[PDB]
Amino acid sequence: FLPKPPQEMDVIWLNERVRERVRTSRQVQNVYRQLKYPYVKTGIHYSDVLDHWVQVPMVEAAMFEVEKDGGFDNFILKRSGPELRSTYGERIRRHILVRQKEIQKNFVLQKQAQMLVESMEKEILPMEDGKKVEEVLEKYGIDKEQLLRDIARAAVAKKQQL
Amino acid sequence: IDMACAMLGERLLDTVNASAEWQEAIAMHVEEIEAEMEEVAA
Amino acid sequence: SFNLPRERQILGGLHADWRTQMKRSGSILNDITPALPDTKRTEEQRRRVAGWRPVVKLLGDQRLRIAIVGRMNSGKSSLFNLLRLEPTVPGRSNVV
Amino acid sequence: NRAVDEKNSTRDPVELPCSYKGRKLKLIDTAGLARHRYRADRDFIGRIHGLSVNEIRFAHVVIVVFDATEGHPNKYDMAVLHSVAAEGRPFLLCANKWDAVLDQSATAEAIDFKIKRQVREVKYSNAVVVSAHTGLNLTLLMDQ
Amino acid sequence: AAAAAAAAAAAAAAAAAAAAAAAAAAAAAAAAAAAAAAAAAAAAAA
Amino acid sequence: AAAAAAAAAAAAAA
Amino acid sequence: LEEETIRERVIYQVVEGVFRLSPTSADRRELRSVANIIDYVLTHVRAARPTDRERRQERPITSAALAVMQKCPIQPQLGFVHALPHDTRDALLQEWERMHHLDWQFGKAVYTPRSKENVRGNLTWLREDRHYDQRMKFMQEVESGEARAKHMKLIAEAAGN
Amino acid sequence: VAPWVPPPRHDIKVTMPPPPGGEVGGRFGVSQGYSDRLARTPYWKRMALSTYKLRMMENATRYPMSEHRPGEYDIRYLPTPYPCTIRNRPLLEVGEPRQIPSIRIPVIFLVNLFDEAKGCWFGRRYETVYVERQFMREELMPQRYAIYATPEAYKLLGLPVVNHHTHEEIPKTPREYEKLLERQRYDEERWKYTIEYLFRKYEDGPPELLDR
C-alpha cells in the first residue's frame, strides 16, 4: 500500500510501496511483523527549461529513473498523470510545459528577428547617406536612438572580449 | 522588433569593422557604457 | 520476433542454494568470521613500534622450540592440541 | 599478538612468560567476553567466551580492561569483575584508550562512582588508567 | 548643533534621492518633464 | 575553454 | 522617525524644489520616515514614466515589417501563460514563501517572461532547432518540386497495386 | 453526478471492443474491456461497416505481450487484472540491505571543462565521459557544462547515436556493479574480445623463442 491514496500522495513513489516483513522468533512458535518504507531522498535537480534549481521529495528509484531519462523535465514529461501520483509532480509538469512553450515562442521570435535583419541588410547593404539610412529605418519601423545604443553596446562587448 | 534592432546593430558593426554625427553618438554611448561598467565594478 | 524478455524465474531475488542464502543472512548463521589478512602498517606505525620499549622482559623458553607451519585446514591445530598437554590449566584446547 | 579494529580480533587464549622486577609471571590474553544475548545467537563466540572463562578460572590475578572512550565501565564489565571475584582471583580494573578519552576528570569520576556503587568486595577494586599507544602507567599497572 | 544636523540631513536626503533617481534612470525623463510639463506628470495606466 | 573546481558551484543558493 | 518640525521644512525644500510633488494629509502623516518619503517619490516617478500603451501608440508597427513577419513561415502559439497553476492563498504567506527558499521547495516555481534565453544545453531549444532545420529542408524540396514528383509516384504506384 | 460520462479511453476499433481500461489508462482491476457503443451497435451494422481484411486486422491480438505497454505481459491474461510486478518491482527487496556503490553515469560535455585543481580536463566539447552521479547532478548540469548521455540527446546534438543503457538494471551490490561495468566495457570495445586481440601477445611466437 501507499501512505496516501493515489490522488493524495504528494511524494513521488514510482514503484516503491510500504511492505510488512515477517520474522519468526528464536522459537518458531510466534512471529513478529514490521512495516518498511522506501528511502525518500529530497531530489534537488536542475531543469534546463526552467533554468533554475527545483527540489522535490523523491526516492532513490526516482533519482535513478531521472538519470536514466536524462533530465528531470524529461522524466516528468515521460511519466503520465496516473503513473506519476504526485500533486507536486503535476505542478512542476505544468510549470515545465509553460516554460517549454515559452522556449518555443522565444525561438520563433529570434527567427522572426533574423528574417527581419536579413531583409533590411539586403535592402541597405551599400552605404549611401544617413538620409537614406533613416528613410529605410522609418520604413521598417525602428528608432535610430536605440539602434545607436545597441550598436555601442555591441562595440563595447567586442572590445571587452578582444 | 527590438531583437531585430540588436542583430542589425551587431551586423552593421561587423561590416564597418571589416570594411560622422552617428559615429560621434556611438562613441558617446560607448563612453557612457564604459563609465557604467566601471561604476558597477567599483 | 515472437519471443519473451529474459527474466529470472525464482521470485523475490532469492537464491536456489540455501548455502548462498545462509551466507547472505550472515552473522546469526555463520558465526565464524573469515580469515584476517595482514593489517596495513604505516611507516609511522612501524617507527613507533620500533621506538617502543619492553616494560617486562620476555623469557626465551629454555626447552626446544618447535613451530608448526602450513596452509589453512592442514591439521596444524589438531596436531598442536594432540601434542600439547597442560597439567596446570585444563581446558586449553585450540579452536578447531 | 595482532590488534585490528575487528570486534573479535582473536579467538584463542595466548600465554607469554616474562619477568617483571625479578618476579616470574605468565601474561595471558583472552579472546573476549560477550553477553549471553549475543552468545546464544552466535554459539561459536560463545565457545571462545567459555575458553576465556576457563582461563579466568585458573588465573592467579585478573585484569579487566574497559575502553575509557565509553566514559565508564559497563554493566557487563561489572558482571565480569564480580565473576572473577566469585572465582576468587585478585581483580584489577584498567581504563584503556586514556590517551584518546576527552574528559579525563569526568571519566575518572564516573569510574570511581561505579566502583563505589558496587556492593561486594568489588567496591574495593582499584581502577588505573592505562593507554596502549602512548604507554602510560604500564609499570604502575604491573606493580599493582 | 541643530543647524549642522539639519544641513547634514538635507545633504544626505539629496544624495539618496539622486542615487535612487540614477538607479532607475529617472533623471532622463525627469529633465524632459521639467522642461515641458513641469506642472504635473502622470501616465494613463490601462 | 572553461575552468571550475570540484566545489566552486552549489546547486542550492548558499 | 523624522520629527514633524524638521520634516515639514525638508519636504518643502526638497520635494517641491526637486520633484515638484504634492502629498496629501495622510501621505504626509505616513511620510515620517526617510524611507517612506523616498519610496513615495519613487512610486510617483514610476507612475509618471511613460506607459507601454503610450509608447506603442507613439511608435507603432510598420506595414513592411508586419508583412515580413506574416510571410515568415513560423508563427508563435500564445496562451501558454494560461496553463501555469494559479494558487489562491494568503498574501503574507506568499510573500514569506517568495522571500525564503519555499518558493521552489514543493512543486513551486516563479514565472518571469524572457525575450532571449540561453541555448547551450537546452534540449527543448535543440529539438525545436532540428525541427526547424527539417522544415527548411522540406520547404526546399517543395520549391524544387521533388515533393510533387514523390507524391505523384506514390499515387501512381497505389493505383497500380 | 456526471452530466457527461467519458467514453472508453481507446475505442478506435470498429468491431472489437476496447482493451481493458488499465492497459491504456491508469485504473486496473478488470481484465475485459467494454464499450457501450459497440455493444449496442447491431452485429449486422458492425459487419457492414467493417471488412474481412479490417476484421482480421482488428482481431489480431498480441499474446502474451501487451500492445500498448511494450515489453510487458498484458493484464487480461495475468492471474489478476493488475499489471505484473516482476519487472516494476521496488528497487530494494524487503530483506535486502542497501549496498549500492557510487555508480557512474555517462555525460556529454558541451564545453571543454578544465580541472584547474588537478591540472587536467574533465572532458572535451561533445565528448562522453563517465562521471559521478552527485557531481553531474550538482555541478555540471546546473552550470550547463554537460548533459546526460541519451540517444535523444545524441540525436539533438547531431553526434552519432549510442544507446548507453544507463541504469537499465540498477546494481544492488559492488559485484553486480562490477558486472555492469564489464558489460559496458564489452559493448564499447567489442573489438577487444576478438581471438586475434586475445592472442595478440602471441602474434608471431613465444617471446623466449623470439631472438633478441
Ligand SMILES: Nc1nc2c(ncn2[C@@H]2O[C@H](COP(=O)(O)OP(=O)(O)OP(=O)(O)O)[C@@H](O)[C@H]2O)c(=O)[nH]1
Ligand atoms: N587510541 C588508542 N586506541 C587503543 C588503545 N588501546 C587499544 N586501542 C584500540 O584497540 C584497537 C585494536 O584492537 P586490539 O588491540 O586487538 O583489542 P581487541 O579489539 O579487544 O582485540 P582482541 O583483544 O585480541 O580481541 C585499536 O583500533 C584501538 O582503537 C590506546 O591506548 N589508544
